[PDB]
From a paper:
The V/A ATPase from the thermophilic eubacterium Thermus thermophilus (Tth) is one of the best characterized rotary ATPases.
Here, we show cryo-EM maps corresponding to three different rotational states of the TthV/A-ATPase. The position of the central rotor DF-subunit in the three different states corresponding to each state is in good agreement with the 120° steps taken during the catalytic cycle of V1. This is accompanied by re-arrangement of the AB pairs adopting different conformations in each state.
Numbering used by the authors:
A (entry chain K): 21 to 60
B (entry chain N): 152 to 201
C (entry chain L): 2 to 63
Write the structure that this text describes.
Amino acid sequence: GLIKSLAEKEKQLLERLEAAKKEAEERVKRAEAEAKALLE
Amino acid sequence: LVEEALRKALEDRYLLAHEAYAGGVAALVVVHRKEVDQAKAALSRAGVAE
Amino acid sequence: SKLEAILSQEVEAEIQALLQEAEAKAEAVKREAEEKAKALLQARERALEAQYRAALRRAESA
């Protein structure tokens, strides 16, 4: 019944996953920007 | 007895907790969600109740 | 725990997968643009030159 351990790790990871998604979309949005410019 | 049921299913991939209140200890098994059937089943073999 | 170790590595592999996914979608965006821009420019150059060749024709014809 290690509790603490398992009850910290699940938080730490989670907000790292959240963050991943943001940086991720940004890359698409970068190419989107470039897409916009290149036509414009 | 339950601990044995759990031990067989869960191994060590559970960390197994109890807190007293007299007349027994209110108990938790924490397992992965994935491990859940095996854990519930350990209770089932035992006849211990939620 | 060993228990949380698996949770860590699992979540982390999703982090890695999102970024990777994103890159491919970015390329896909990228590749639209390239073709599109090119595709716009040719046809309208094309058209003007025909409107040129035809324009002089009428001139000459006068």
